[PDB]
């Protein structure tokens, strides 16, 4: 084979349609389904799979008690076929660690996993199932990565890392990898102030990433990466549509070389597709909780500080619990453009449901269409009382 | 394909990083996971798998009562993907027997398994999934083998066997196999006095094996095998760092043409990487029990009887139960050197935990790195009370 190149444009997005859904909790009630968090979707040239970090226990086991904590020596990155639940008998382990990211470059898959204590943390870069290279910490404060998939161009796969306070300035770096090896890295630049958990996609040029600001505001940072030059810049989305959670109420005028204030030290992973007029943003419905989920068509959101939605679609009702979301694409599909897709984590259990001592998620994902299609709701459908 | 040749050197080892972990017991609490012992790791040209001897029962079944005994007609060698638990639905059986070893020569896999009564025991050599050759006993006292993987060079795979008292002199032999057939064998020679359960790795020349002395001392034997000449020698490690378990307290000066005394008729499987300055030894923390595990960098340990550690890493805390350990390598990986790796068995249940009537293990493994990475702990994380 050869390396995948970013040559096609994005398809026009008129509506979204369902791509996949595992119903992991509904199944888990009576079967050997693993407890997971932080799911994402990624495709190889001929296959799409779900990825997630498991807790080293099944939903109904007794070791499911306390799964609310996310950094432990029992966590690992697993992969399983789309729309199947993450069962113990069909999952493959990709790596070990409490935080990770992965992607395919057209020849093979790269996977980066972070493990260790909060200070003396480390990351191991795997390629084609072999460990290749390692990274130690620099700030010594819970090294973090993207969670969602990475995008490669001609063999080069930029990856975003953070080490430092999650409630203050932090040192972030972009590493450029090829076949698992480090070509170079850069200190992050531009006007964004705090970067975490970036969701990225490529088009015909560079790679665009939507990230979380977990310090000052509800205004998401955007990173623009040029994989050939291996250079980048950053800014916030200039739009009076806030997308983080929690968030203050939407202003009439947005700003973008400064985070929009009002909700400190918090936020969630999310995504956007920025394409001039063909621009869509995702967010929760609730401004105070991880509940509901919607897509809004907001033309020129990246640069127009008075832009407002002109079209949209409800994915998850605000009556239903939501979770982290992010973007993905099939870069090997036939056609002259890429079909944009995204996924949403549906979180059940603690801390919102205190009747159980575990936490878990189900996953739903959707892809764009050029047709105007109808809409429906996508809850996980699990009855918490069945687990009591 | 062709045969694998031992042509590359060892990589510099500055630190160890996690390679894999199954969490078999934590999962087993609520699922159909098999009871095993004596795990090891071995790789084919494109895949790494865990190997272990199963007891013919699941952890939560009623036949798990009494699994403490290790020689029975219900034992078999199984293989399953790295970091997955040894479940009943994803394991492949390689052979039947209570003691075994295996390895890949670049074209196919060889597997040797021992079965039978304590006196009229026998071994069957399999190759490419067919039985090829058989070996009967010579001393008639529980024929034993290496447990961990074997190393092949240009098709020849030396294997170490023992038949005789485990508490006195015994007859040991080295067999040289090719494509499952016996080319020759040799009575063991050199100055080592008692050899069991050898852990071997190759470099650019020969094959180096670290073995257990289960009779006179805490000073591990080393066997040096030349696979081309099909000849060998032996000695003990000349280092005042004892590595067996139980062991007396470390002396100031070691010795090596005689076992270091003080703890008779006991000991465990373990390993070392001997490479002049780039020398690392593994051992338990406890001197009296199979608890904890650490790696020590002890330059020139093979020959310097006053050498002491200059660097090290804790793998398992002494608060946690440990078990057998050993070495392995991926001999098909890209690069100019071999990345050294090792594994540790974590034993749970009887005889240390008398609240349950079974025994089982979880497995963790690590590989070297040239970077200086931090360290963490790797317990299995199972709550014994959940099984009561």
């Amino acid at each position, epitope marked *: 084979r050869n390396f995948n190149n970013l040559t096609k444009g994005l398809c026009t997005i008129n509506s979204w349609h369902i791509y996949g859904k595992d119903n992991a909790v509904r199944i888990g009630e009576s079967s050997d389904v693993l407890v997971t968090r932080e799911p994402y979707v990624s495709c190889d040239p001929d296959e799409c799979r779900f990825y997630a970090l498991s807790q080293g226990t099944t939903i109904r086991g007794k070791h499911s008690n306390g799964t609310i*904590h996310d950094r432990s020596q029992y966590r690992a990155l697993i992969s399983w076929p789309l729309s199947s639940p993450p069962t113990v008998y069909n999952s493959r382990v990709e790596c070990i660690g409490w935080s990770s990211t992965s992607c395919h470059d057209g020849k093979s898959r790269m996977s980066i996993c972070i493990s260790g*204590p*909060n200070n003396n943390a480390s990351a191991v870069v795997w390629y084609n199932r072999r460990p290749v290279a390692e990274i130690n910490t620099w*700030a010594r404060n819970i090294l973090r990565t993207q969670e969602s998939e990475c995008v490669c161009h001609n063999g080069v796969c930029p990856v975003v890392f953070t080490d430092g306070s999650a*409630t203050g*300035p932090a040192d972030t770096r972009i590493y450029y990898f090829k076949e698992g090896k480090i070509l170079k890295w850069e200190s992050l630049t531009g006007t964004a102030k705090h970067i975490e958990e970036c969701s990225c996609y490529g088009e015909r040029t560079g790679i665009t990433c939507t990230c979380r600001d977990n310090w000052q505001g509800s205004n998401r940072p955007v990173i623009q990466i040029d994989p050939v030059a291996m250079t980048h810049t950053s800014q916030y989305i200039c739009s009076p549509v806030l997308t983080d959670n*929690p968030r203050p109420n939407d202003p009439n005028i947005g700003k973008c070389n400064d985070p929009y204030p009002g909700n400190n030290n*918090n936020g969630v992973k999310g995504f956007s597709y920025l394409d001039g007029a063909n621009t869509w943003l995702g967010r929760t419905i609730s401004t105070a909780s991880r509940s509901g989920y919607e897509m809004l068509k907001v033309p020129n959101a990246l640069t127009d500080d008075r832009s407002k939605p002109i079209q949209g679609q409800t994915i998850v009702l605000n009556a239903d619990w939501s979770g982290y979301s992010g973007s993905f694409m099939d870069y090997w599909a036939e056609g002259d453009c890429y079909r944009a897709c995204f996924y949403v984590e549906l979180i059940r259990g603690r801390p919102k449901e205190d009747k159980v001592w575990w936490t878990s998620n189900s996953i739903v994902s959707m892809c764009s269409s050029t047709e105007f299609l109808g809409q429906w709701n996508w809850p996980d459908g699990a009855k918490i009382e069945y687990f009591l | 394909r062709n045969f694998n040749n031992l042509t590359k050197g060892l990589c510099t080892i500055n630190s160890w990083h996690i390679y894999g972990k199954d969490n078999a017991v934590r999962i087993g609490e609520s699922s159909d996971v098999l009871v095993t012992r004596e795990p090891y790791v071995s790789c084919d040209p494109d895949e790494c798998r865990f190997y272990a001897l199963s007891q013919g029962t699941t952890i939560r079944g009623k036949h798990s009562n009494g699994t403490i005994h290790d020689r029975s007609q219900y034992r078999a060698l199984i293989s399953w993907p790295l970091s997955s638990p040894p479940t009943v639905y994803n394991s492949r059986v390689e052979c039947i027997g209570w003691s075994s070893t295996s390895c890949h020569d670049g074209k196919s896999r060889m597997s040797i398994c021992i079965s039978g009564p304590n006196n009229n025991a026998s071994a069957v050599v399999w190759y490419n999934r067919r039985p090829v050759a058989e070996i009967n006993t010579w001393a008639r006292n529980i024929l034993r083998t290496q447990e961990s993987e074997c190393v092949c060079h240009n098709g020849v795979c030396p294997v170490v066997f023992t038949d005789g008292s485990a508490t006195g002199p015994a007859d040991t032999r080295i067999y040289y196999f090719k494509e499952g057939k016996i080319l020759k064998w040799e009575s063991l020679t050199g100055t080592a006095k008692h050899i069991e359960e050898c852990s071997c790795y190759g470099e650019r020349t020969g094959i180096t094996c670290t073995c257990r002395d289960n009779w006179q001392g805490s000073n591990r034997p080393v066997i040096q095998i030349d696979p081309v000449a099909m000849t060998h020698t032996s000695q003990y490690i000349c280092s005042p760092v004892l590595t067996d378990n139980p062991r007396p307290n470390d002396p100031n000066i070691g010795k090596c043409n005689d076992p270091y005394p003080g703890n008779n008729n006991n000991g465990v499987k373990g390993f070392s990487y001997l490479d002049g300055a780039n020398t690392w030894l593994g051992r338990t923390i406890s001197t009296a029990s199979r608890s904890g595990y650490e790696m020590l960098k002890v330059p020139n340990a093979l020959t310097d009887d006053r050498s002491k550690p200059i660097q090290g890493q804790t793998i398992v805390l002494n*608060a946690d139960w440990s078990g057998y350990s050993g070495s392995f390598m991926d001999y098909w990986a890209e690069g100019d050197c071999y990345r050294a790796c090792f594994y540790v068995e974590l034993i749970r249940g009887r005889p240390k935990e008398d609240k349950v009537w079974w025994t089982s293990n979880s497995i963790v493994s690590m590989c070297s790195s040239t970077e200086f990475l931090g360290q963490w702990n790797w*317990p299995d994380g199972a709550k014994i009370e959940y099984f009561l």
Partner: antibody
Amino acid sequence: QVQLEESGPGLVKPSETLSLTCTVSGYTISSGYYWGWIRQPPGKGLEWIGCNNHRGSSYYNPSLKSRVIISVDTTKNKFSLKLSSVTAADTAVYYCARDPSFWSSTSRTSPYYYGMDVWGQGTLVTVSS
Amino acid sequence: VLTQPPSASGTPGQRVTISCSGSSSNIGINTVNWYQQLPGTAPKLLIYSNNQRPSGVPDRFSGSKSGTSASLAISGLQSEDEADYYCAAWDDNLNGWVFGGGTKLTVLG
């Protein structure tokens, strides 16, 4: 010897933001030790709130973060604590303290996590109508 | 949260101990500190790094840790040692200073 002293209102109404300031004297805080705050309800034990340094590398108690801000003014050798939406449960003695952890004291022979060696005398804050 | 008994006691001159315990994310991995609070003031650090003490702390105060539990031993109990004693440790799940509440040590007489 560095001295620490808390000051601010002893009374805040419910829902209001509480603001306390700790003045540091005898030491320039731009030098890097972490400074932070501890709470002690009148009949209870101690609770850590958070700490920060001159570079803003803050740490906060997860139960309070997003409600609480700790900042450092190197120019005036002062640091301060702010908590939005105070409630009855926030009545407590507040203390400011110095923390030499994270090798911020400029030593690598120290425990990474050390403890809090310098304490101010503290102040009592009541939340009431 | 760390666990401590609510009280401890002994007569002058006796050796008494205060225990502290729970989890693998905190004292089970990191070091443990002990602080002493008198009724009218801020707590003083007595023990850090499991068994070290700051200059000025009497050697009658001796810390020890094993497994997932720890203790403070007070030799030569004095009337002046009546106090609220606290156990504390960094806990990686929260990533910041967990306390065990306190133990009231009463000197009898």
